[PDB]
């Protein structure tokens, strides 16, 4: 439970809303027990008094206790469910901010896109499980413990031995039964997560490879193996229902043991009285009622294992070391920037390596050519400072790139990534992301000037766009990435692969889009195409991580060379 400490410290912010929602749970449970305990005594005392004791018996105080106990029993439960859920959402927001504020310095490579991005569904699910800790674990367990102690202390004023055995049975099952059932059903819970993921693997390998399995005549043999896993999976599921069935029967026998013990022991003597009379019902009805506080307590402990497991994943995922550090110097963004590389790798090393060592002037459009299969360029990762370069040094305007703070580095460089993202927000917010201070007119002009005239439809900027709403096509989505880079207005622009997967009618249209609108900027492009390299200068041909040829298109093409071979033939 050490791994759960960093998230319990998030509860300090709302220690009043969280604690009040527990106090209302105890008051509701104390009124639940008090209503049936007072009622049991009131029926006994009235019957013992009889009609002859109508005037002697004070029946207006107990009859006002049942009114008060029946009002806080129903009003307290309404407010408990209300305050608990309010505070559950106020720590969900705190949990959401806490993890997002710690996954930002780790954003490019700290996550590393592990498990084929099945990672981020398991982070929303694990954050939603640390949310359950207060309402599914802490509230049922803390509430039950101090309900037991109050009735144990309360009944002590009448009889010490009776109060201790009733509370002792209730305390003993609060501390013994939940751990014993979590320990008894831990082998099955392990054998059920393993068999669930084994069936999921055998199913995905059976649906993905249905074409292969059918033609090779084995689609009915792997169905039998798939069906045999489900039989073993349903047995693990069945055996965790026999413990739940056995834990619900034992809770009923323990609550039966308390009622019978009070009947047998409280009839002997109550508080040193040979003839307890109406007192006998005060104890057997406080034992009938007090075991509803123990109803949620075994399931609460069962969930604490799930919460602890999620806390470990969130603590290891966001408890890493950032790959880069940004010094804070409050530098001034340059109006014109000249990117200077010096012996820096272009892709990852392979097959077991001098750098590019290029130079880009203040406003030169430069393109970098590379073969498709050799590797994926890490120039934009290193230029946006996703990770520090192992060798060489990047200079932005004759100053090392590490000296720029995060605020100013993001403003000198505006990239159009290959994988461009549609935020689930209005089209205004997908554009206002780049320049947060633009007006509705400026956004309208850019949307027209990039060729996104369709998006400026009757619905307009306010139209929802993203996962929930509209989905954009690759060519239309590519123009959205350029729209952000035009609004961001950085002196340097990096283009990962501006035309990949686009047909020639829109592949061209993008090229004069970049040329006509990024004419004053220091654009540096990376492509595996030779369509629009004519409008650029100092085309760089990369071969095995080395510059083999460099120069403008006409000069580079005029002489026989590698770029000449690319133009005609494979």
């Amino acid at each position: 439970m050490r791994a759960l400490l960093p998230y319990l410290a998030l509860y300090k912010r709302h220690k009043w809303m969280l604690s009040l929602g527990i106090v209302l749970a105890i008051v509701t449970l104390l009124a639940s027990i008090g209503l049936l305990t007072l009622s049991g005594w009131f029926l006994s005392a009235s019957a013992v008094a009889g009609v002859a004791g109508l005037y002697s018996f004070n029946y207006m105080l107990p009859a006002a206790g049942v009114r008060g106990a029946a009002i806080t029993r129903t009003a307290g439960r309404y407010f408990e469910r209300l305050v608990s859920h309010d505070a559950t959402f106020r720590v969900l927001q705190h949990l959401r901010i806490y993890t997002f504020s710690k996954l930002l310095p780790l954003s490019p490579a700290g996550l590393a896109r592990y498990r084929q991005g099945e990672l981020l569904n398991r982070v929303v699910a694990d954050v939603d499980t640390l949310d359950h800790l207060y309402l599914r674990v802490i509230s049922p367990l803390v509430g039950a413990f101090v309900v037991i102690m109050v009735v144990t202390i309360g009944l002590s004023f009448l009889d010490f031995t009776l109060a201790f055995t009733l509370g002792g049975i209730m305390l003993l099952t609060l501390f013994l039964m939940p751990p014993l059932f979590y320990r008894a059903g831990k082998s099955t819970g392990q054998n059920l997560t393993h068999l669930r993921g084994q069936y999921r693997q055998q199913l995905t390998a059976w649906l993905q490879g249905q074409a292969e399995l059918t033609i090779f005549g084995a689609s009915d043999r792997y169905r039998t193996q798939l069906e045999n896993t489900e039989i073993q999976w349903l047995e693990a599921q069945r055996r965790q229902s026999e413990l739940t069935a056995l834990s619900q029967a034992i809770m009923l026998l323990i609550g039966a043991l308390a009622v019978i013990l009070m009947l047998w022991m409280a009839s002997g003597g109550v508080g040193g009285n040979a003839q307890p009379g109406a007192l006998i019902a005060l104890f057997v009805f406080c034992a009938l009622a007090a075991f509803e506080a123990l109803a949620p307590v075994t399931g609460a402990f069962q969930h604490l294992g799930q919460v602890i497991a999620s806390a470990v994943r969130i603590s290891d995922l966001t408890d890493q070391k950032p790959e880069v550090t940004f010094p804070d110097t409050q530098t001034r963004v340059a109006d014109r920037v000249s990117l200077t590389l010096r012996d820096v790798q272009f892709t990852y090393p392979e097959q077991s390596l001098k750098g590019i060592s290029l130079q880009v002037n203040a406003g030169e459009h430069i393109a970098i050519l590379g073969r498709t299969g050799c590797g994926k360029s890490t120039l934009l990762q290193q230029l946006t400072r996703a990770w520090d370069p192992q060798q060489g040094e990047i200079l932005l305007n004759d100053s090392p790139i590490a000296s720029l703070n995060e605020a100013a580095l993001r403003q000198t460089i505006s990239v159009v990534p290959q994988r461009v993202h549609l935020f689930s927000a209005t089209l205004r917010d997908n554009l206002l992301l780049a320049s947060p201070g633009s007006s509705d007119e400026a956004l309208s002009e850019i949307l027209r000037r990039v060729g996104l005239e369709k998006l400026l439809e009757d619905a307009g900027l306010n139209s929802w766009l993203g996962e929930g709403g509209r989905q954009l096509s690759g060519g239309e989505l590519r123009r959205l990435a350029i729209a952000r880079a035009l609004l961001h207005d950085a002196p340097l622009v990096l283009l990962d692969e501006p035309t990949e997967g686009l047909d020639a009618t829109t592949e061209s249209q993008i090229l004069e889009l970049l040329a006509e609108m990024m004419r004053e900027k220091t654009v540096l492009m990376v492509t595996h195409r030779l369509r629009g390299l004519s409008r650029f200068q100092q085309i760089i041909v990369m071969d095995n991580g080395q510059i083999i040829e460099q120069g403008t298109h006409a000069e580079l093409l005029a002489r026989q060379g590698r770029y000449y071979q690319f133009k005609q033939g494979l």
């Binding site: 999921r200 059918t214 084995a218 006998i280 935020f423 595996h528």
Partner: protein, 587 residues
């Protein structure tokens, strides 16, 4: 829609016919449990009266205690017994539904499956079918116990005192009257707040999947404030919904508090000589008041649990929403006749104006006319918007056609797939290895092949030249989605799988598509030689090496608009010449 909601639970209640014995024992054991509750409240009330009013020592009450202990053991037995019987109910429907989902998902075959991602089908079979368990295991048996048990208390209390049985029964219509009266708000708050809560639920994951884009624009610090804003709005919008849904829950808690208070004060006053009414012209006893007071909380206990189990109906109808459509979508199927080829020699495909129909109904290929004599190697090349791969599926048997596609003179609509596919072996992009070990993946074609003939396929496919790098060699395990082997190293096993048989037709659906620079050469080296032995039909986007292939067909929106060898067709200046230009321009 309520009409859909009504007919969704009609589907749910008609899926319960399988294992109706388990849902009848649960309903029977809910009647037995409602009697043992009355039995123990009568024994406890008669013991309590004896030792409070008649001052009988506990040792003289050893018979009622023995019975009282017995009805606690029995009542704890049926709780253990009807939790197990209830589970066996949920387990049978799920097993039978899952069997006819996989069955329906196998008749449709590869053509329909590839329409959705693999994880989309796993949700339908893993997550969406386990969501109907709590409906049948807990919720459905509870509606039996919520109507059986409360009526038993009213029936049991009525002989003792009809005023105590009228307090409990009086609230029987009042609870649904007020639950539905406040249910207008819960159906109103979930109308105004449904859209926003749909957008807000899923906002955190959206911002979390775009941290790379937020980083490059310096908006990380300004999206923490957007998460703060989108969570304050989520909390107060989803509490306006809950604040009305806790009035419905609190109504039942109000009427159980009122009934316990009215039972206590009616009996307490009547014992005292005030408020004399309700009994059957006989003095009300203490054992009458105790029985009513013990059974008053248990009259509403069945109804309270039904409230907690109601979420199980919410998810099991959502699961039924996505499962009822799945089992009712009309699906095309190949006619799968009973003809069989009688020649091992390569087949001769002839096609006369056939449309290839997707299972959903739409056509994928227009009017196709072509002819492949025996041993010929065709090749289909297009702009990726041509649906050329649909022709390969139709030849494989995964698609339905409304023309003529007779193979070797026999109409393919009449071939038995189980015997036609024995002459078929094929390779394609995104190769799938379903078997466990790398040796078994290759032997998936035929497990009776001799190990010497196995070495021929493991050698000709250039897969034995990276086996030593693997830990165990031929017997190394192949992980999830062939994780141990790279995509280049995976396809060379698939090629080795195809080469293990003397097939009559070979179908290459873009092999060496996303392979590396070297593995593509090894696949193409082995798979060009293999294509010569038997008639083939290959889909490509690599136009460089098609010089030696017999005939080339180009597709534009599903028609063969050019034919002929590469040499004379390259210089013709048609769409292929422009098609080859796009290939050569992109290094």
């Amino acid at each position: 829609n309520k009409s859909r909601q009504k007919e969704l639970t009609r589907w749910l209640k008609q899926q319960s016919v399988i294992s109706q014995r388990w849902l009848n024992i649960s309903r029977l054991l809910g009647f037995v449990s409602g009697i043992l509750i009355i039995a123990q409240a009568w024994f406890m009330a008669r013991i309590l009266q004896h030792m409070i009013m008649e001052n009988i020592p506990r040792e003289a009450l050893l018979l009622p205690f023995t019975l009282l202990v017995l009805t606690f053991v029995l009542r704890a037995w049926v709780v253990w017994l009807r939790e197990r019987v209830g589970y066996h109910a949920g387990q049978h429907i799920r097993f039978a539904i899952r069997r006819q989902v996989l069955d329906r998902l196998q008749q449709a075959g590869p053509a329909w499956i590839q329409g959705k991602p693999a994880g989309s089908w796993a949700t339908l079979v893993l997550e969406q079918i386990d969501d109907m368990h709590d409906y049948y295991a807990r919720y459905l048996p509870q509606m039996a116990l919520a109507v059986s048990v409360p009526l038993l208390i009213v029936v049991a209390i009525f002989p003792s005192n009809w005023a105590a049985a009228l307090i409990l029964l009086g609230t029987a219509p009042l609870i649904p009257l007020f639950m539905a009266l406040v249910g207008m708000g819960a159906a109103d708050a979930n109308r105004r707040n449904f859209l926003a809560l749909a957008r807000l639920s899923g906002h955190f994951l959206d911002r979390l999947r775009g941290m790379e884009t937020l980083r490059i624009f310096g908006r990380g610090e300004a999206e923490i404030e957007s998460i703060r804003s989108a969570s304050e709005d989520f909390r107060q919008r989803t509490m306006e919904v809950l604040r009305l849904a806790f009035l419905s829950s609190g109504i039942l808690e109000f009427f159980t508090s009122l009934s316990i208070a009215l039972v206590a004060v009616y009996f307490g006053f009547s014992y005292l000589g005030e408020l004399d009414f309700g009994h059957y012209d006989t003095g009300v006893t203490l054992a009458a008041g105790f029985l009513a007071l013990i059974l008053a909380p248990e009259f509403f206990q069945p109804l309270r649990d039904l409230g907690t189990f109601y979420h199980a109906k919410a998810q099991a109808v959502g699961a039924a929403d996505s499962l009822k459509t799945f089992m009712e979508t009309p699906l095309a199927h190949p006619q799968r006749g009973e003809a069989e080829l009688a020649s091992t020699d390569p087949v001769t495909i002839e096609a006369e104006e056939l449309f290839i129909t997707s299972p959903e109904g739409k056509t994928l290929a227009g009017p196709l006319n072509f002819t492949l004599p025996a041993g010929q190697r065709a090749v289909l090349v297009g702009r990726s918007g041509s649906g050329k791969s649909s022709l390969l599926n139709a030849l494989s048997g995964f698609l339905s056609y409304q023309g003529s596609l007779r193979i070797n003179g026999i109409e393919l609509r009449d071939l038995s797939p189980e015997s036609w596919r024995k002459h078929l072996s094929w390779v394609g992009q995104n190769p799938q290895l379903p078997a466990a070990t790398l040796r078994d993946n290759v032997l998936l074609a035929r497990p009776d092949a001799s190990e010497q003939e196995l070495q021929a396929a493991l050698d000709n496919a250039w897969v034995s030249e990276f086996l030593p790098l693997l830990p165990q060699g031929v017997d190394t395990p192949v992980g999830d989605q062939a994780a141990r082997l790279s995509v280049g190293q995976a396809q060379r096993v698939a090629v080795a799988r195809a080469l293990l048989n003397p097939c009559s037709l070979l179908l290459l659906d873009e092999p060496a598509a996303s392979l590396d620079a070297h593995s593509e050469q090894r696949v193409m080296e082995a798979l060009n030689a293999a294509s010569l032995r038997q008639t083939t039909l290959m889909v490509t986007h690599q136009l460089e090496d098609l010089a030696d292939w017999d005939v080339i067909w180009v597709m534009q929106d599903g028609r063969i608009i050019e034919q002929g060898r590469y040499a004379e067709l390259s210089v013709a200046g048609g769409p292929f010449a422009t098609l080859l230009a796009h290939r050569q321009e992109e290094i």
